[PDB]
Each structure stands twice: as structure tokens, then as C-alpha cells.
Amino acid sequence: ESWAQSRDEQNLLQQKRIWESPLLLAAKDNDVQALNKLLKYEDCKVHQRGAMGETALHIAALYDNLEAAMVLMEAAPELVFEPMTSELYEGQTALHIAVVNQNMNLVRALLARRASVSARATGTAFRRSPCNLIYFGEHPLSFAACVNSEEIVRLLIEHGADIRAQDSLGNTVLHILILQPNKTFACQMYNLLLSYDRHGDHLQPLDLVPNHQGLTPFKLAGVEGNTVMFQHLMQKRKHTQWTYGPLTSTLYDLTEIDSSGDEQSLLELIITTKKREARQILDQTPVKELVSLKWKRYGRPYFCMLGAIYLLYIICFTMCCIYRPLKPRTNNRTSPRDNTLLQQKLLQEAYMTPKDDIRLVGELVTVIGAIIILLVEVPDIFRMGVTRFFGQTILGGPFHVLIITYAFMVLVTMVMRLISASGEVVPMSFALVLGWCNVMYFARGFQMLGPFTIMIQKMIFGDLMRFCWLMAVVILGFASAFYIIFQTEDPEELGHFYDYPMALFSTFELFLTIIDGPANYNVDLPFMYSITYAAFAIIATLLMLNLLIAMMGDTHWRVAHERDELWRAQIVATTVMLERKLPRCLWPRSGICGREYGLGDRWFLRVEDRQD
Amino acid sequence: ESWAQSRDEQNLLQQKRIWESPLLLAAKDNDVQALNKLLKYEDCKVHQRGAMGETALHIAALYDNLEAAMVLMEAAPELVFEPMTSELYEGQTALHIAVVNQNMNLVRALLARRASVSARATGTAFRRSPCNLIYFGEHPLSFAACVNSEEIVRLLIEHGADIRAQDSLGNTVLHILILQPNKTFACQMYNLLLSYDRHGDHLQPLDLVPNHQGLTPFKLAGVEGNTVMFQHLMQKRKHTQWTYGPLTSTLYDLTEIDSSGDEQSLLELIITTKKREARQILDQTPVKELVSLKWKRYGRPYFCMLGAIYLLYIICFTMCCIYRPLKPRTNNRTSPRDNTLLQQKLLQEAYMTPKDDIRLVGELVTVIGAIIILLVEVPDIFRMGVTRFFGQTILGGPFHVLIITYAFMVLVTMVMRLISASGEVVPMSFALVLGWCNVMYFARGFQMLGPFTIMIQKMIFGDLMRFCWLMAVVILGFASAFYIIFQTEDPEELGHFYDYPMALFSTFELFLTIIDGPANYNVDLPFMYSITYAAFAIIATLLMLNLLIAMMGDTHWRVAHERDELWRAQIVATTVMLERKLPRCLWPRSGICGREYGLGDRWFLRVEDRQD
Numbered sequence A, B: 001e002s003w004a005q006s007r008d009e010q011n012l013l014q015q016k017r018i019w020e021s022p023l024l025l026a027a028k029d030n031d032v033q034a035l036n037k038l039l040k041y042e043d044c045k046v047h048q049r050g051a052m053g054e055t056a057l058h059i060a061a062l063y064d065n066l067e068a069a070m071v072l073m074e075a076a077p078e079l080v081f082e083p084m085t086s087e088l089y090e091g092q093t094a095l096h097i098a099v100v101n102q103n104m105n106l107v108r109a110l111l112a113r114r115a116s117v118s119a120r121a122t123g124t125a126f127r128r129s130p131c132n133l134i135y136f137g138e139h140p141l142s143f144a145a146c147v148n149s150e151e152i153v154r155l156l157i158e159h160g161a162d163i164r165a166q167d168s169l170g171n172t173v174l175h176i177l178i179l180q181p182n183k184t185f186a187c188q189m190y191n192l193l194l195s196y197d198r199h200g201d202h203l204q205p206l207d208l209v210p211n212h213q214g215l216t217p218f219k220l221a222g223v224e225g226n227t228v229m230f231q232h233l234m235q236k237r238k239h240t241q242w243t244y245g246p247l248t249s250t251l252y253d254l255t256e257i258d259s260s261g262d263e264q265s266l267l268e269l270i271i272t273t274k275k276r277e278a279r280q281i282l283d284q285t286p287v288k289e290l291v292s293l294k295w296k297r298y299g300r301p302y303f304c305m306l307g308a309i310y311l312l313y314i315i316c317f318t319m320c321c322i323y324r325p326l327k328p329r330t331n332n333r334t335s336p337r338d339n340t341l342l343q344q345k346l347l348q349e350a351y352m353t354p355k356d357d358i359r360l361v362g363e364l365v366t367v368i369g370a371i372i373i374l375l376v377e378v379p380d381i382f383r384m385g386v387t388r389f390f391g392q393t394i395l396g397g398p399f400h401v402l403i404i405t406y407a408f409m410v411l412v413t414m415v416m417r418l419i420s421a422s423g424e425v426v427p428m429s430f431a432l433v434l435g436w437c438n439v440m441y442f443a444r445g446f447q448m449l450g451p452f453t454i455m456i457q458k459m460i461f462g463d464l465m466r467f468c469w470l471m472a473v474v475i476l477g478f479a480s481a482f483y484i485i486f487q488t489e490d491p492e493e494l495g496h497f498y499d500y501p502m503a504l505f506s507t508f509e510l511f512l513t514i515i516d517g518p519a520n521y522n523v524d525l526p527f528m529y530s531i532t533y534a535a536f537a538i539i540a541t542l543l544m545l546n547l548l549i550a551m552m553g554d555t556h557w558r559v560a561h562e563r564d565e566l567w568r569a570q571i572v573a574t575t576v577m578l579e580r581k582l583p584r585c586l587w588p589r590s591g592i593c594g595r596e597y598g599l600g601d602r603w604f605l606r607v608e609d610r611q612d
């Protein structure tokens, strides 16, 4: 916005000041004879500051003018130690520019005059940001690795580059290559930089050194969805046991992958990333066999056991609403439109028989069970929802909004029972619907979990809610029309639209065709009704048929074209929740440990397969 | 389960005890220097057993080490006569391991030291099981044939390996090649092992030796759907008569294919197996014209006659239920909600007029026709498939269950008629519905109805069982809400939810939109009715749209491309059933008997075809 306008004016007044200054211009235009005349005129203003604090060496390096960049050196050798001074390109020297532009003959002549290989481009354009378009690090050795130039990397380290150097984000030169868009070229540069880590006394192998978020180069490849570097780093963690003809028993490490409770694991960090490429890591041969192992053995059976206890809680709540205390009414019927026969009992007369004491036991099971919902989930939606992730699990999305809304409605029914307020049917009727609609979500884990089952259910609900916005204006147009047509008529003969909230609810029902069209045949209806309702019935039929076709066309686009899994991240983030809630004695750790088989303290997973 | 927990701990215990013992380690690492050290120290415990009861010679053959394996054999040659004595790898010798690993120079080393080529590896990890990735037999000829090694098969026969050795479930080496995943490589090995059957004095040749289930290799390729080896084994059963340009008159054997009437044939095995590529053999040439021969000539006439006799029998049963004996009621009505006017007559009253004697003939035809159902179908589910194929063949046809359940309901109605019990309308109502829905069975015998009935009848138990559970959750949740909203109201105006079972039935009907939404308009309905029913109608719309989208994917797309294949497989199961039940005087045996043409007592089918 205001900042994007600021970058654009900054680049235009850069080119404006390179044209209105001759030594900046000849460095750009590679006018080698124009340098000799101006520099012999008593070295005029060789300490230039252009738009981005640039000197004339920065211009000559930027446009790959090797012949013009030489003349600046013998004229004043103090320009090779000069950075750019603006906020956007802060700290960038000429050695950074020639490395990114891959100018071989220039970068030797810079090192020939002792250019610092440990400079730090701290500017706002050299920071990881979606507004920035490249993130190449902060060091010249980091710039050489990202543009894929093997010969510069061998040249820079020879002059003393530090491969252990880190950024302001803590990323070393091996963290940055995982962030690069071309994966295959970054895979060759990874093997190169590890070969120069001879260094057996640095107390840490360099591909274990964490950034300021604690992530290793292994975990960062799992978070950023870099599947090419993930499979490359996994051969460091395999161990082939035997090969019996076509069979092979491979043993995987599972130290930085499986959860230990005290530390965030790779399975959790894929979920909170919310990226589309990070879910491809869940398809990989150590991780894919781990998720299906614990969602077959502990994760799924405990999911169905918690849903069976919730079903007994809602049945116990349902019985207390059916047998709610009611007495015949005390006052007389006011209007002839008053249908009410019964009313609620007061608190003193609610409990005076032994059959009410059986109900009182059931009413206390409900309230105690409603507090437990608040005591375990008011932490959860703070932890889960706004901090890490929301709506990408099974039992997920509008489950946690609704079951919190359930337990709120039960405690409202308790208050209205105590102060003997009228209208407890209103918090109960919400709580029956809210409570039983949550049972449909536990029914989602009774499935074999295909790749396009839960996301299609989530999709169809998403299109129906978009259809309800477009049909609200169609109802409001025709309900207002139907209201003023029958506004001069007698509602004893046709009372579908007798006041305006009823006319709105009738037109909603006629749209879905769940009540019949109004007709009497013993009296003359207005003529404007018949042509309006014939227009309404054609519109409502076509809009309901186009809804079905639009759900078919949107189903095809997300199965055949969007090509996103969604089905492994749902069973991961469900299994993470049940593992933090249950104690350790009910949850054995997946894999098998060492010290009785002699491999360490590490929890290995054996995978046996057939090559064919 | 705990089976993989016990299996994975032994593979780590194996690698542990290799790492513990110096003799097992240096043989594993092919460190033959320590092999000479540990033998000249002492003739030690060189008959020690690790995890899976193995020796140092088993390890050296497992990890493909020529040099380490030799040193064990000159030191102590008695290790070659040693099987693994655990339960997982019981019976396996080092000769088995070298063959599977295809270490050809090690095979010469063992056979020069007279390694027994008839050892039977009868372990747990060698049986045919869905938990095993391999089923290679129990013999070294069987192990060599399944890894596609010609030079080892030639080497083992020359050293006296029995080519007709059998597993402990019956299979010879010719059976095992059909059970292999690579069909093309098995065909070359099949031709090779018959080229060593020169020594025929054995009454059954190798391609005519049954296993413990009676199946030959030709029938086993039929059951397993091995269409590659089926066509190759059909070349042995052909007989080409003449070639007249592009024409060819091939004569087929039909001994193991056609129903012999004593043994289960090839047609009977393919129908009674739960496989899909086995059904593809119904399009192979000698079977395809055999099936069309039986149906066009004797199957379709006997099926249309049986469909016409059943149709008249149900019309006779229908008129006996319409004219069932009823008299006016004796007592007076109790409540004004009592709607009953008539009740049943008794046996003394039900047969007094000549119209009752006409009905008595029709009732006896009904009872006799239900006993004949229980005599041709009940001694078919007790001898053949005692309780198993009574449930196993239901995927082929559910109409066995419906016609037996019909035949009981007629006899339940008979017993109640004799003891004058009340409530004959309950067993009749099941019998009328089950009587007329069994007419839909005979729709398969028509080309106009057959393929279209396949698409209509095809319902999916993965999504409709999901729909029935979620429908029941909405109905129990919203009928409970609708019950307590109208619990205080007058039910003579709106009586849809007057007690709780009717509210369950009204909400069921409103979900399917088969009764109108409740409305009076002459009285004030409660406010929570409009909120709940609008929420209910959007949920009921969504669950229908979830059901249509579920019916448009990956199963109905499969049936829409396979309905001609699925209909021609119902023709086979109908024809095979009719050929068993009808006597041999009404069903002539197919093909042409070659007794009067000099061909043996075999029944030949003649097929003329154009190669062009």
C-alpha cells in the first residue's frame, strides 16, 4: 500500500540520480573512456551517496560492467569496504552484488583487494518476508549457495568464509538452502557444504545446529514441505537390517519425528504450519507408517470410547428434558389464539415425590458433566484455536464452538431452575439440538478415512451456507410481495402471511417445498398472488436444481484438480490431542527402544517391504 | 496386534546377538581375518543359536559373503546339515537362503559339500498367509522358481531334487508359480519345469496333480484369476481341426471346465469365490461360448417358466389375503380413539359358505408351495455350506434369505389360523412384501431389464450405513426438541408430537419430506418451533445432498462401466444353479461326445473363428 508505493518511488529516483550524475552514468553505461577523464579531474566526489547510499562501485558491480569496475579500484581502493547505507539495502557491499550476479572475474579482483567475506546485509530487503521475493541469507557465502554457483563457494571458503555463520533469524547456510524454490539444485549444494565441515571439534555437527526457533535442517524440511530434501536427509536416519531376496527390513530413527511430550515434534509442526506442501511430508515412508500405526491401536479406539461415553451423557440429558416438571396452568386463557395448557412448576413443588429424586440424580449428572466440558476445553480452544490451528482435524471446526455452546446452555437451564424463571424450553431446545448434532462428529471417526471423505463433507456444508446468503434476498423479495398482496384479505381463509414474521417463515418453507402452496378454492384469491407465486415457484425450482449441479462441479474441482490430501493431517491432529489428555500408562510409546538391543536411547520403527 | 510386536523384537534380537558374538559379527561383516583367529583359538561353540535359531553359516549366506561362508565350511562341514530350530523360520537351511539371495557361487559351494536339496522349510514365515509378503513353497526348487533363476533350477535337478514335492497344504511347484505376482516370469519357469518331466511313468503328470483342495494348476489359474497362465494352459486343451484361409475350427476339451455333475467344476469355483479378476475368465474363449450355449438353449426357457409359476403363486397368495375371514367386532369401543370395526373369524366361522371352500383351495396351494421352498432350499444350506455359505454367498444373492423368510411367514400364518390366534395381519404383511419383492429376482433373465437392474439395485454399504446412522441422530435430537416445545400446548390443534413415539415418527416423515410441516395459523405456535424447524429443514437438506454426492463417486462410476460384465456373471450363477437342481433328463450335457468319432469319452466343444 503506502510501503509498496514507497519502494516504487525509491527505484525511480535511483534511476533519476544515475542519469543526472556523469560518473554514476558512465559506470552504468560502461563508458571506459569517460571514467579516465572525470577521475583525473581531482577525484571529484568519489565518495558518492546515491538513492540507496550507493557508491560508484555498487553501480558498476550491479550492471556487470567489469571494465568500468576496474577503474574505480585504482582510483580509490577504499570503496571496496563500503556498504549501502539506506534502510532497504543496509550493509550490502559490492562483494554481495558480484556474487549474486555470478561475475567471476570481478569477485577475484574484490578478494584481491581484501574484501570482507563476513559482511552482513541487515537491510529490510534481505529479510524473510512475503513482500520480499528472494531470501538468500545475510552473508556472501549464503548468497553464493542460493544462486547455485559451485566455483564461488569453493573460492569464498578458501578466502576464509564461515559456514557456521547465522542470520538474524539464526539460520545457517544449510537452513537457507531448504527455503530455496528450486529443490534439486539445492540438494547438490547441501552435499557440497557438508563436505567442507571437516571440523571434528566444533561440539555440534553443523546439520544439527538449530535456529532461533530450535528447528534443525531436518525439521525445517518437514515444516516447509520440502519433500526432496526430506527424503535426502532420511538416508542419514535409516539402517538396513537384512535383505532376504526381494524382502528388506529397514529400521528408521524416529527421534525428531515422534512426540516426547516435553518437546514439540515434527508431527505437530506440520499442523500448525497450515501450509499445503507440509501435508505432503505425512505421505513419506517413515511418517506414513507411524500415523497409521497409532491410529489403529490407541488413537482410533480411544476416539470411539470417548464418543460412546458422550452418547450416554446426551441420552441422560434427553431423559431429564422429557420428564421436566410441568403442571396445569393457573390463569385463564387470554386470547382465542392462546394454545397453552401446561406450565412449569416452581422449585418447591418440583421435587416432592421419589420419582423426582430419580430425576434429580439425572439432572446432577448433566450439570457435573457440563462443567467438565468447560474445564477441559476452555484451555483447548485457547491452545488449539487462535494459537496453532483451527478446523482441520476430525471432530473439528464447528465441533468445539457447538459443544462449548452446549455447556453454556445447560448452565443457563440450571440458573433458570433455581430462580424459578419462565421459559426453560428455550435453553433446552438449543441444548437438545446442540448436544445431538455433536454426535455426528464422533461418527466421523467410525470410517476408514479415504483421502476425499471428510473434506467433501466439509465442502458441501460450505456451499450450502453460501447458498443461504443468496436465497435470503430471494425470500425477502417474495415474502414482502406476498405480505402486501394478502394485507387487505381475511386471514381466516388463508393465513399463511398474516403478519410479516410469519410471511417470512412461510416463504422459506415454500422455497424448500416443505409446506404446500396456499389454496382455498372456496373463495377468490387476489390475482396478483397467482402470477407472483408462479414466478416464485419457477425461481425456487431452478435455484434448488442449480445448487445440486454446483455441488457436483465443485466436488470435481477439489478431487481432480486441487489435488490436496487433507486426510492425514486430520488424524495426526486428533491423535496429538488424545495423547496430551490421557496419562502415559494408557499410551505406550510407538516404536521399540534401545539398551536391550543396543542402539542407544532412540525409539526405532521397523518397516519390512517387498521390492518386486 | 501383538504379533508384529513379537515379530519386530526378534529382528532386533537377531542383530543384537550378531553384534554380541565375535564369530557372528565377522561373518556378517565378511571380516575373514577374525574367522581364522577364532577357530585357531579353540574349536569353540560353533553350534550356538541366536534369535531365530541360526548359526554362523546361516548369517554368512544371508548377507551375501562368499569368503566368509567358505571358512565355516572347511573348519566344520557339519553346519550345512542344520535347520533353524525356532518357530518363525523352522526347517530352513543355508541352502534355502543362498538360493533366494541368488548367490550362484555359494550354491556350487554347498552342493559340492552335498547340501540336501529336499529339506522342507516348514516355518511360520513360509506358510501362505495374508501377513506374509512371500509364499515361495518349502523346497529349494520352489524357492528358485519363484525368484526367476534358471541356472539354479537346472543345478538342483541334476543333484536329485524331486520336482513333484508338495507343501503342507498340497501345492507342487507348478501350483506355486501361479500364485506369484509377476505373471510373465512365471510362464517361462512353467515351460522350463515341464521340460524336465521326461520320466513319465507316474500315473498323473505334473500339470494334472491336485493339491489338498482337489485343484489342478489349470483350475488354480481359474480360481485365482491368472488370465495370463489360463490362456497358456488352454493351448494344451485345444485341438485345431482345419484352417481354411482366415478360418479356424478349434475343438476344446471341456473336461475340467464343464459341470461333470460329481466334482466342483471350473464354472462352480469362479462363482463361489470373492475375487474380481476371476470373473474376467468368463470372457475367455472356451468358457464364453459354453455359457452362451447353456443359457440360449436350456437356461432361459427354464428360467422364464419358473418365473411364471412363481408369479401365479403370489397372485394366488395375494387373493387369499384380500378375502381373509373377517366379522364385525363383538364388544364396544373403549375410547373415541378406537378406530377398529372388524375382527377375525374363528375356524368354526371361517369355513361355512361355498366361497370359503374356494378360498380353502387357494390357501392349501399357498401352504404346499411354501413347503416346497423349504425342501429345495433348506437341504442346500445344511449340506453345502452349513452356516458359512448361508452367509457367505449372500454377496452373490440375497434372494435366498427373502424366499426362506417368506416361507416361514406363510407357516406362521397357518399355525395362527389353526390355534385361532389374533394378529394374522403381522405375519401376512411381511409375507406380502417379501412375496412380491422376490419377483425382482427374475429380472436378470432379460436383456432389456438385466443391465439396468444392476445399476438400480447397486447400493453402497459404506455410505448408506453412514446415512442411516446420521439420520437416526437427527431424528432422536429433533424429535426430543419438538416434543418439549409442544409439551405444554393443546394437541387437538397440532397433534404431530403428542407423545414421544409419534414425535419419533413425525420427525422421521418430516426428514424425508413425505408429510407437510406442521402449521395451524389459527393459533399462536411457540416461538422455538420456528427456530428449530428452520434449523431442522436445512440439516435435512444437507444430508440428502451428502447422499447424492456420495452416490456419484468411484463405485457407481465402476458399475456404470461394468454392467454388461456384471449381468453376464449373473447368467452363469443362474445356469449353474438350474443345472444342479433340475434332473439330468431335462438338462442334456453340453458339447459333443467324442465316443463315436475316435476321441475318447470326452465332451468336445467346436468353435469356428476368424483370425483376419
Ligand SMILES: CCCCCCCC/C=C/CCCCCCCC(=O)O[C@@H](COC(=O)CCCCCCCCCCCCCCC)COP(=O)([O-])OCC[N+](C)(C)C
Pocket: A390, A391, A392, A396, A397, A398, A401, A402, A405, A455, A458, A459, A460, A461, A462, A463, A465, A466, A468, A566, B538
Ligand atoms: C444457515 C445460515 C446461518 C449460518 C451462518 C454461519 C455459518 C457459517 C457460514 C459462514 C458464511 C458462509 C461461507 C461458508 C463457510 C466458510 C467458508 C468455508 O471455507 O467453508 C468451510 C466450512 O467450514 C468447515 O466445515 C471447517 C471448519 C472451519 C470454519 C469454522 C466454522 C465456524 C463455526 C461456527 C459455525 C456456525 C455455528 C454458530 C452457532 C453455534 C469448508 O469449506 P472447504 O474449503 O471446501 O473445506 C475444506 C477444509 N479445508 C479448508 C481445511 C481445506
Ligand SMILES: CCCCCCCC/C=C/CCCCCCCC(=O)O[C@@H](COC(=O)CCCCCCCCCCCCCCC)COP(=O)([O-])OCC[N+](C)(C)C
Pocket: A468, A469, A472, A473, A498, A499, A500, A501
Ligand atoms: C447467513 C445467511 C442468511 C442471511 C441473514 C439474514 C436473513 C434474513 C433474516 C431476517 C431476521 C428478521 C429480520 C426482520 C425482523 C422484523 C420483523 C418485525 O418485527 O415486523 C414488524 C414490522 O417491522 C418490520 O417488518 C421490519 C422488517 C422490514 C425489513 C426487513 C429486514 C431486512 C433484513 C436485514 C438483513 C438482510 C440482508 C441479508 C443478505 C445480504 C411487525 O410487523 P407486523 O406484525 O406484521 O405489523 C405491522 C403493522 N401493520 C399492520 C400496520 C403493517
Ligand SMILES: CCCCCCCC/C=C\CCCCCCCC(=O)O[C@@H](COC(=O)CCCCCCCCCCCCCCC)COP(=O)([O-])OCC[N+](C)(C)C
Pocket: A308, A311, A312, A313, A315, A316, A319, A320, A323, A324, A353, A355, A356, A358, A359, A361, A362, A363, A365
Ligand atoms: C451405549 C449407548 C447405546 C444405546 C443404549 C442406551 C441405553 C439405554 C437407554 C435408556 C434406558 C431404557 C429407557 C429408559 C426409560 C425409563 C423408565 C420409564 O419408562 O419411565 C418410568 C420412570 O422413569 C423416569 O421417570 C426417569 C426420570 C429421569 C431419569 C434420568 C436418567 C437417570 C440415569 C442415572 C445415571 C445414568 C448414568 C449415565 C452417565 C454415565 C415411568 O415414569 P412416568 O410415570 O411415566 O413419569 C413420571 C416421572 N416424573 C415424575 C419424574 C415426571
Ligand SMILES: CCCCCCCC/C=C\CCCCCCCC(=O)O[C@@H](COC(=O)CCCCCCCCCCCCCCC)COP(=O)([O-])OCC[N+](C)(C)C
Pocket: A300, A301, A304, A305, A308, A311, A443, A446, A447, A448, A449, A450, A452, A453, B461, B462, B463, B465, B466, B469, B553, B554, B555
Ligand atoms: C464399546 C465402545 C466401542 C469401542 C470399540 C473398540 C474397537 C473399535 C475399532 C474399530 C471400530 C470400527 C471398525 C469397523 C470396520 C470399518 C468399516 C467402516 O469404517 O465403514 C465404512 C464407513 O462407513 C461409516 O461411516 C460407518 C459404518 C458403520 C456403521 C456405524 C458404526 C457404529 C455406529 C454406532 C452404533 C453403536 C456403536 C457405539 C455404541 C455406543 C467404510 O467406508 P469405505 O468403505 O472406506 O468408503 C470409501 C469409499 N470411497 C473410497 C469412494 C470414498
Ligand SMILES: CCCCCCCC/C=C\CCCCCCCC(=O)O[C@@H](COC(=O)CCCCCCCCCCCCCCC)COP(=O)([O-])OCC[N+](C)(C)C
Pocket: B309, B310, B311, B312, B313, B315, B316, B319, B320, B323, B324, B355, B356, B358, B359, B361, B362, B363, B365
Ligand atoms: C399373468 C398375470 C395376469 C393374470 C393373473 C390371473 C388373472 C387376474 C387375477 C385375478 C382375477 C380378478 C379377480 C378374481 C375374480 C373377481 C373377484 C371374484 O369374483 O371373487 C369373488 C369371491 O371369490 C373368492 O373368494 C376368491 C378366492 C381367493 C383364492 C383364489 C383361489 C384360486 C384357486 C386356483 C389355484 C391356482 C394355482 C396357482 C398355480 C401356481 C368375489 O365375491 P365377493 O362379492 O367379493 O364376496 C367375498 C366374500 N368372501 C370374503 C367370503 C370370500
Ligand SMILES: CCCCCCCC/C=C\CCCCCCCC(=O)O[C@@H](COC(=O)CCCCCCCCCCCCCCC)COP(=O)([O-])OCC[N+](C)(C)C
Pocket: B391, B394, B395, B398, B401, B405, B461, B462, B465, B468
Ligand atoms: C425380519 C425379516 C426381514 C428380512 C430378513 C432380514 C434382512 C436381510 C436381507 C438380506 C441379507 C443381507 C443383506 C446384505 C447382503 C450381504 C451383506 C451382509 O450379509 O452383511 C450385512 C448385514 O446386514 C445387516 O446387518 C442388516 C441390514 C441393514 C440395512 C440398513 C439399510 C436398509 C433399511 C431398509 C429397511 C428399513 C427398516 C425400517 C422398518 C422399521 C452388512 O454387512 P456389510 O455392510 O456388507 O459389510 C461391510 C463391508 N463393506 C463395507 C465392504 C460392504
Ligand SMILES: CCCCCCCC/C=C\CCCCCCCC(=O)O[C@@H](COC(=O)CCCCCCCCCCCCCCC)COP(=O)([O-])OCC[N+](C)(C)C
Pocket: B300, B301, B302, B304, B305, B307, B308, B309, B311, B439, B440, B441, B442, B443
Ligand atoms: C404369464 C403367463 C403364465 C403362463 C404359465 C405357463 C408356463 C409357460 C409360460 C411361458 C414359457 C416361457 C418359455 C419359452 C420362451 C422363453 C425363451 C425365449 O424364447 O426367449 C424370448 C424371451 O422370453 C420371452 O419373451 C417369453 C417370456 C414368457 C413369460 C415369462 C414371464 C416372466 C415372469 C417374471 C417377471 C420378470 C420381470 C420382473 C421385474 C420386477 C425371446 O427370445 P429371442 O431373444 O427373441 O430369440 C431370438 C429369436 N430371433 C432370432 C428370431 C430374434
Ligand SMILES: CC(C)CCC[C@@H](C)[C@H]1CC[C@@H]2[C@H]3CC=C4C[C@H](OC(=O)CCC(=O)O)CC[C@]4(C)[C@@H]3CC[C@@]21C
Pocket: A398, A402, A437, A440, A441, A456, A457, A458, A460, A461, B531, B534, B535, B536, B538, B539, B542, B546
Ligand atoms: C435460525 C436457524 C437457522 C438456527 C440457526 C443455527 C444453524 C445455522 C446451525 C447451528 C449448528 C447446526 C449445525 C449443526 C450440525 C450440523 C452437521 C454438519 O456436519 C456433519 O457431520 C454432516 C456432514 C457435512 O457437513 O456435510 C455440519 C453443520 C450441521 C448441519 C448444522 C448446520 C446448521 C445448524 C442447525
Ligand SMILES: CC(C)CCC[C@@H](C)[C@H]1CC[C@@H]2[C@H]3CC=C4C[C@H](OC(=O)CCC(=O)O)CC[C@]4(C)[C@@H]3CC[C@@]21C
Pocket: A467, A468, A469, A471, A472, A475, A499, A501, A502, A504, A505, A508, A511, A512, B530, B531, B534, B535, B538
Ligand atoms: C435455506 C435458504 C433457502 C434460506 C436461508 C435463510 C435463513 C438462514 C434464514 C432467513 C429465512 C428464515 C427465517 C425466516 C423467518 C423466520 C421468523 C421467526 O419469527 C417467527 O416465526 C414469528 C412468527 C409469528 O409472529 O407469527 C424467526 C426467524 C425465521 C424462522 C427464519 C430464521 C432463519 C431463516 C431460516
Ligand SMILES: CC(C)CCC[C@@H](C)[C@H]1CC[C@@H]2[C@H]3CC=C4C[C@H](OC(=O)CCC(=O)O)CC[C@]4(C)[C@@H]3CC[C@@]21C
Pocket: A306, A309, A310, A313, A365, A368, A369, A370, A372, A373, A376, A377, A393, A394, A395, A396, A397, A399, A573, A574, A575, A577, A578
Ligand atoms: C459424569 C460423566 C457422564 C460426564 C461426561 C463424560 C466426560 C468425562 C467426557 C466424555 C465426553 C467429553 C468429551 C467430549 C469430547 C471432547 C474431545 C476430545 O477429542 C479430541 O481432543 C480431538 C478433537 C479434534 O481432533 O478436533 C476427547 C474428550 C472431550 C474434550 C471431552 C472430554 C470429556 C468429556 C466431558
Ligand SMILES: CC(C)CCC[C@@H](C)[C@H]1CC[C@@H]2[C@H]3CC=C4C[C@H](OC(=O)CCC(=O)O)CC[C@]4(C)[C@@H]3CC[C@@]21C
Pocket: B306, B309, B310, B313, B365, B368, B369, B370, B372, B373, B376, B377, B396, B397, B398, B399, B400, B403, B441, B573, B574, B577
Ligand atoms: C403347489 C404349486 C402350484 C406351487 C408352486 C411352487 C413354486 C411357486 C415355487 C416353490 C419352490 C421353487 C422355488 C424354489 C427355489 C428356486 C431358486 C431361487 O433362489 C434364489 O433366489 C437364487 C439366488 C441366487 O442365485 O443369487 C428362487 C425361486 C426357485 C427357482 C423356485 C421358484 C418356484 C418354485 C417352484
Ligand SMILES: CC(C)CCC[C@@H](C)[C@H]1CC[C@@H]2[C@H]3CC=C4C[C@H](OC(=O)CCC(=O)O)CC[C@]4(C)[C@@H]3CC[C@@]21C
Pocket: B468, B469, B471, B472, B475, B501, B502, B504, B505, B508
Ligand atoms: C440404527 C441405524 C444404524 C439405522 C436406523 C434407521 C431406522 C432403522 C430407524 C430410524 C428412526 C425410525 C424409527 C423411528 C420411530 C418410528 C415409531 C414406530 O411406531 C411407534 O412406536 C408408535 C407410533 C404411534 O404412536 O402411532 C416404530 C418405528 C419408527 C417408524 C422408526 C423405525 C425405523 C426408523 C426408520
Ligand SMILES: O=c1c(-c2ccc(O)cc2)coc2cc(O)cc(O)c12
Pocket: A544, A545, A547, A548, B544, B545
Ligand atoms: O433429490 C434431488 C433431485 C432428484 C433426485 C432424484 C430424482 O429421481 C429426481 C430429482 C434433484 O435435484 C435436487 C436438488 C437439490 O438441491 C436437492 C435434492 O435433494 C435434489
Ligand SMILES: [Ca+2]
Pocket: A515, A516, B515, B516
Ligand atoms: Ca402436502
Ligand SMILES: [Zn+2]
Pocket: A556, A560, A561
Ligand atoms: Zn476436470
